[PDB]
Symmetry: C3
Subunit: 450 residues, 3 copies
């Protein structure tokens, strides 16, 4: 429904389209952060530092444990039902996340079993296999430093030095835990934490964790780049100091009929002024419908755009009509003295603002002049097979854009300034004029009677 | 003064209120960054690396020392007066900071005493306690690495290797000093630096520093999360290479009469279109007055909102009237196809857009239908004690909201698009119409005297 | 062309001007990232880890190598021409970057020479002196760790432990390579990467690299602070696992006739309301023209503001006329209860809002009262040589601003609210009024002729 012919007359072309894929999650795995390292081979040389580390962790873990218990106390078997009167107030996201928290909850007996299995481990990353259960992955954030650096030096360094070295690592690890799970974490029940954000808490790298979870394949890099691998908090243990997370590797589903277009613009000249049409960087089409496209959570892979959130949001009716071929609906803005988008290659042709750059025909050696009654030049092989546009020599193919029409056959839109202060200054001026004409505007019917 | 009854008719409710606390500082402590480590036990193996490290530090420290001297030269005893004619131009913030710099500074004789005490220490963190003065905390950024890693290896590694290892740490530490205090630091006189931003310069962790400064208590986590612990520069020494900072632990004072409200919204349906009322996330009230609330510097603790800056700023009169019960003043926007806020639990009742989600009464198994001449459904126990709204079973309490009124009894506001380009396109179109009607608008009085 | 006299009547002054300098590149140097470390002295204790590291690197390097080959295949000797019909679609930036890529491409014979020289080195940073060509700088990201930590410990640590320690470093280095050159880097051809963003890939610090490249001088800190040292990808080798970059140290050219002004405001009082003129933080003048100034890529050095991008962009005509002396064109906004900009020192005089702060003359003890028919007070020595404004004692010089005129001789502009939602609410209200008056508005000819 995008009218490319009319858009090209104001210097707007598309430079690439792609399919739209979103993420859905079906399976969830468990990942436990083991906050207490195994220090058996350090022979009580870190007793003071460990005790301080535990005290600091309690101030972070206790508020989260209370928050989790506050929601799960209001969920009972019906399926399950929520005691809305007891809960009082909650958003849809909180309610949905609370149900999943109650469902994807390790049973109390499994918690006792998990506690014992954690105590016997001394590795940084270990899979815990319970009979007739899903594998639980346990990660200890300072175990590698203990096993690789501190234990081999036990016969070389003093007992006090060993404690000091571990103490530095423990306090830095607590800082990261405070950053992730401290007061900055609004609503732990509904929080979704990306695997990258957990990197330091997992030992400073996620590659081994991803391998142990079995997350691999051709879509991994795109999914990972869009931050599509998310973890949710399901249990906080303040007695044994561990945190249970539920993590899911999503599957990609193409959305039928959605095309994501990348727009690109070239400036044009009206006399001695250089103007530029204001259009979005990306737009989405589905049949007749035109919508904006938010690329903030998307990765543009060769096989399509992978987005970890909903990227489609509505576009105003006036902007839609601009994209449907109404040039007078499109706004335009002035450009700085040194503007880089003064020509573009599109469908084998050159669309250039030859009033602001030097257009020369390399084949004949002649300079290409842009008529003052026109705003753009459409260069194809029928007029110049090889062209020098800005000192760059380019060969162009057969004509795909008609020869430029006069300015009087193009209806141009209003000039605007997009800056925050410019908008405020011009809007206040407009509101003042409307407020000064209120008496005229209110009596519209009486004036229209005459 | 917020009219909750009329707001709920367009799907706006409050999901929580809290008190408002601000920070004030009374006492200040001195914290000196000792840039030159103690390398006595390294036996001259780092001579070249230390010399290069000193040269790089001078390029950073000298501009700051000149800036500090340029301000203090204009402050003289009256109990001090600023020579405004000599200074020429200065903002209020610069003037106030300059007075504090002149007041809160170690005297010249105390600088010599501080210089001698710094040279004799060899620890990463050490309290310097003078006769009849406040304690001064000295921090050395690479001393832990020297004491824990380099010195124990002196009899194992070559002299060349020792220098190379420390040289790497010195350059990395200089990079952080350049980031903190280099050309990016506009106006060192009035700059306030959070303790978190100093973390690397203090050795990579702030927990021990806070303990030594005596900063503890139940408010620490909230204050630290809001970045309420700030340091200012009071002295730069380019001969012994240290920086003196003044740091204050704030006290929290609740502002009486201020309530911070968290607003949440549910979409509503007009025929087949799904609309959403646009309102701020947080608003503040003080009696009859309604203000915007900036949450950027705030932390939402269970006992109230802790902010390190002033969070209240004015709200436009039209938006205030919307919050006072004028529904026609409130703007509305279209939502994407997959919208998450289609129901909410409030006061034990469910406010749901039953035209966009399937509402069913679990008690009787009957579907709940939303009439076309209504926009929302208000579910309470008198109609359905247990209800399923989006696959979630919820029990609701007694009625706290009236049954939905017809759409013709609700005055709805204007549809808008909040995006930056949509605003520019629509504002430009509006301005063009006003400019084309200038003659009619400027001749209003003639049209009215008839 | 800025009218300072009329601006001071609404509390706007300049607090400093500076010259404007931009960056141009003439010479370029080659920097090669050597992804494979030298591990000869580790006696194949890291065989498994190295094999995994190479496998991960291939998934990142191969897409980039294909992208580079896609552009360079379309560039042939004319002194080169682009096959636009084969390329089809490309922006000016992509075309210009592609030409430089073809020109700055190391020839195939030089690539074989470079491959052999990389294999023989074992240092973290090393210059490769190719005969009859420019010096090529080779950087290895983990070589320092191998040479300083692992090799001296070979006789002490187990062979398995050596592999584990290096494996941790390799996976972390790969993560940074994925961040820099992975799917997040769209269009590698035109990408420009700052030297700071390459810091981890170069071993965690750039100071030695800058010294080896010869980049030094008095402008280094300013150029580095504004991110003016940028690298482009010119070759990717998937057989020997290295990346060639082109890096340039820019030269600064002052732009003639451009002055960058910093603006600062003071609040004023109308009755009991405190207002503030809304103006940009920085503005630029060139003769008669007035432009906005983007400070995002600029560093304000004592010798002038150094910018790595074009900082000038157009300013709306209404805002320009405000700065040219039309006070009614300038918008104004309400301020919060605690506003810091209630006085300013300018040209040795104090401009103060004495209705909102306590102004008293220290010389005579009398309080300075601001008349309700005035909005500001201009304090000079002819009325009070030494004045206390907000508890701060300031001496002021001779009069440089006339005595405040009455409010009825000042034309004030429209009140506005700059917030995103406040703009949307008020714009929607204004659009609705225009839409309700559409029939009247498109009747101007009939209404006047009556
Ligand atoms: C810490 O690690 C040690 C091993 O270094 C653990 O001891 C192991 O415990 C398991 C229990 O299943 C036994 O199968 C192993 O034989 C034990 N190994 C050794 C060397 O004794 C120990 O349980 C861990 N936890 C604590 C608290 O010490
Ligand atoms: C493509 O652009 C042309 C030129 O702007 C449009 O022609 C205008 O059409 C309107 C009616 O919609 C007429 O009132 C104007 O006079 C025309 N302007 C001209 C000829 O300069 C044309 O409608 C656009 N095409 C589409 C499909 O929107
Ligand atoms: C570096 O540290 C050493 C200690 O390792 C300092 O020497 C100490 O100086 C204090 C001065 O108050 C004495 O009380 C200690 O007895 C000294 N210790 C030793 C072991 O001699 C030394 O002063 C520091 N460096 C410099 C350059 O002064
Ligand atoms: C609550 O909303 C109702 C409905 O929008 C408001 O009723 C309007 O009141 C104005 C006068 O303020 C009348 O001109 C309109 O005709 C009414 N609209 C209706 C009944 O649909 C009511 O004023 C609002 N209450 C408050 C306190 O603002
Ligand atoms: C790895 O480093 C070694 C040295 O540690 C390199 O061997 C040197 O190579 C240079 C250049 O050919 C010779 O001049 C030296 O005599 C060599 N030294 C030794 C001790 O043999 C080696 O080439 C590097 N690369 C590899 C792949 O091993
Ligand atoms: C400086 O400000 C004064 C006061 O606002 C401006 O005087 C106005 O001038 C316009 C014409 O431009 C008259 O219509 C108004 O009546 C004047 N307003 C007054 C006197 O209050 C004056 O023009 C401004 N100077 C410049 C150079 O723009
Ligand atoms: C040493 O550590 C062991 C194992 O935890 C413990 O049982 C014992 O009491 C410790 N001895 C001390 C702290 O003296
Ligand atoms: C070597 O460096 C040390 C560093 O402490 C210094 O004190 C000493 O004077 C230098 N020279 C000699 C000869 O030790
Ligand atoms: C690995 O190193 C050992 C060191 O003892 C050597 O004997 C062996 O030949 C090496 N193997 C290979 C495949 O290079």
């Amino acid at each position: 429904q995008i009218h490319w012919g009319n858009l090209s007359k104001i210097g707007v072309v598309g430079i690439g389209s792609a399919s739209y894929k979103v993420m859905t999650r079906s399976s969830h795995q468990s990942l436990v952060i083991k906050l207490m390292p195994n220090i058996t081979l350090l022979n009580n040389c870190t007793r003071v530092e460990i005790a301080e580390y535990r005290r600091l962790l309690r101030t972070v873990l206790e508020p989260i444990r209370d928050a989790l218990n506050a929601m799960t106390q209001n969920i009972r078997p019906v399926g399950v039902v929520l005691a809305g009167a007891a809960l009082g107030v909650a958003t849809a996201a909180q309610i949905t996340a609370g149900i999943a928290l109650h469902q994807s909850m390790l049973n109390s007996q499994a918690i006792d079993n998990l506690r014992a299995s954690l105590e016997t481990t001394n590795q940084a990353i270990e899979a815990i296999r319970q009979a007739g259960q899903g594998m639980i992955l346990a990660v200890q954030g300072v175990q590698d430093y203990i096993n690789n650096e501190l234990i081999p030096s036990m016969n070389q360094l003093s007992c006090d030095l060993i404690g000091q070295k571990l103490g530095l690592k423990l306090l830095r690890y607590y800082t990261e835990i405070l950053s992730l799970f401290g007061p900055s974490l609004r609503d732990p029940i509904s929080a979704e934490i990306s695997i990258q954000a957990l990197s330091y808490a997992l030992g400073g790298d996620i590659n081994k964790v991803l391998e142990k979870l079995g997350y691999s394949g051709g879509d991994l890099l795109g999914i990972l780049e869009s931050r599509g691998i998310k973890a949710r908090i399901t249990h906080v243990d303040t007695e044994s100091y561990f945190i249970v997370l539920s993590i899911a590797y999503p599957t990609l589903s193409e959305i039928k009929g959605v095309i994501v277009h990348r727009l690109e613009g070239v400036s044009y000249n009206i006399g001695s002024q250089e103007w530029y049409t204001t259009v979005p960087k990306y737009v989405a089409t589905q049949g007749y419908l035109i919508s904006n496209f938010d690329e903030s959570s998307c990765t543009f892979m060769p096989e399509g755009t992978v987005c970890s959130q909903n990227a489609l949001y509505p576009m105003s009716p006036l902007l839609q009509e601009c994209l449907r071929g109404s040039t007078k609906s499109c706004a335009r803005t002035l450009v700085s003295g040194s503007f880089g988008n003064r020509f573009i290659l599109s469908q084998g042709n050159l669309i250039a603002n030859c009033a602001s750059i030097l257009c020369k025909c390399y084949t004949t050696g002649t300079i290409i002049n842009q008529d003052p009654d026109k705003i753009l030049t459409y260069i194809a092989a029928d007029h110049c097979p090889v062209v020098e546009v800005n000192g760059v020599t380019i060969q162009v193919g057969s004509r795909r854009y008609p020869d430029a029409v006069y300015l009087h056959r193009i209806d141009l839109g209003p000039p605007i300034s997009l800056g925050r202060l410019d908008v405020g200054t011009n809007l206040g001026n407009a509101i003042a004029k409307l407020e000064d004409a209120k008496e005229l505007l209110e009596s519209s019917d009486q004036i229209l009677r005459s």
